[PDB]
Amino acid sequence: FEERHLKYISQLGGSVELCRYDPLGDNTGALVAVKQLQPDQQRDFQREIQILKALHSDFIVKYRGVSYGPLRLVMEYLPSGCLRDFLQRHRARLDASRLLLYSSQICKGMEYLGSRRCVHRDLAARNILVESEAHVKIADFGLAKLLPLDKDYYVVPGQSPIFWYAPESLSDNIFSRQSDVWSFGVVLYELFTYCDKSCSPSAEFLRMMVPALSRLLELLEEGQRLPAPPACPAEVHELMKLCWAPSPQDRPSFSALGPQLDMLW
Ligand SMILES: *CCC(=O)Nc1cccc(CNc2c(C(N)=O)cnn3cccc23)c1
């Protein structure tokens, strides 16, 4: 991908821009999403490329290549954008079976990420993209880490909204496949609230809630959790409660959650 053939359109999300790969220079070329650095950050970015280039799933945003000119990461562009805003815009159209379809695909994608020893560390509805009405894909691999063969966890202070963090990430910066399962429980809650602002993880935790991180942690240690979303099927709420188990070892695996989500449809 020659840099001189990548034409800027707008900003999407370091930053992600909407560009057109226009070799003919006639405004007929394909639309792409291009990520760039705006030191140690160069090492973080090279890592993101290698991780994403080695991922191959219908439920993970597709790597296209890298750019060359006088380096940028080139990926596929999904016009529908993030799942958070799509859920808010199409509230009346999506029913509990469509929400369970989205839930199942995310889970299948996470199953594949853990098979590749990859911890995402930023799983949330805002970071999932919509391919079509019936197809969702996991994105934003900016905080992704690879677990060594000898280790099952990773020790990192986080700069993401604190409401998606497992207690062991809050109290000790421990990140694992099991902290991704905690976050996933928050993704289900977000899905069944249709990413409504007034009952969002931030809104509802701040109402229930020394520093803020410590207050949230005290609350979670007490066994307090987010309430069942309005009109939530009980079976779904029981699954969120399983993902929010205090001990990482007691949380269901993505391969265990998969058939349970499919059975509900
Ligand atoms: C909900 C707000 C939002 O746009 N969030 C968001 C989440 C993850 C990633 C991005 C930017 N990236 C992006 C890609 C890509 N390949 O990373 C592809 N297609 N689109 C459409 C809109 C944004 C993106 C933003």
From Swiss-Prot:
Provide the function of this protein.
Non-receptor tyrosine kinase involved in various processes such as cell growth, development, or differentiation. Mediates essential signaling events in both innate and adaptive immunity and plays a crucial role in hematopoiesis during T-cells development. In the cytoplasm, plays a pivotal role in signal transduction via its association with type I receptors sharing the common subunit gamma such as IL2R, IL4R, IL7R, IL9R, IL15R and IL21R.
What does the UniProt entry list as the effect of changing Y77F?
About 40% loss of STAT5a activation
- Domain named Protein kinase is located at 6-265
Q: Which residues bind ATP?
A: K35
* Phosphotyrosine: modified positions: Y77, Y112, Y153, Y154
Q: State start and end of the fragment within the whole protein.
A: 817 to 1099 of 1124
Self-association or partners: how does it assemble? Answer: Interacts with STAM2 and MYO18A. Interacts with SHB. Interacts with CD69.
Q: What is this protein called?
A: Tyrosine-protein kinase JAK3
Please describe the post-translational modifications of this protein: Tyrosine phosphorylated in response to IL-2 and IL-4. Dephosphorylation of Tyr-153 and Tyr-154 by PTPN2 negatively regulates cytokine-mediated signaling.
Q: Which organism is it from?
A: Homo sapiens (Human)
Q: Which family does it belong to?
A: Belongs to the protein kinase superfamily. Tyr protein kinase family. JAK subfamily.
Please tell me the disease that this Swiss-Prot or TrEMBL record associates with the protein.
Severe combined immunodeficiency autosomal recessive T-cell-negative/B-cell-positive/NK-cell-negative: A form of severe combined immunodeficiency (SCID), a genetically and clinically heterogeneous group of rare congenital disorders characterized by impairment of both humoral and cell-mediated immunity, leukopenia, and low or absent antibody levels. Patients present in infancy recurrent, persistent infections by opportunistic organisms. The common characteristic of all types of SCID is absence of T-cell-mediated cellular immunity due to a defect in T-cell development.
Q: Gene encoding it?
A: JAK3
- Domain remark in the UniProt entry: Possesses two phosphotransferase domains. The second one probably contains the catalytic domain, while the presence of slight differences suggest a different role for domain 1.
- What residues form the catalytic site here? D122
As annotated in Swiss-Prot or TrEMBL, what is the tissue specificity of this protein?
A: In NK cells and an NK-like cell line but not in resting T-cells or in other tissues. The S-form is more commonly seen in hematopoietic lines, whereas the B-form is detected in cells both of hematopoietic and epithelial origins.
Task: Indicate where this protein resides in the cell.
Answer: Endomembrane system; Cytoplasm
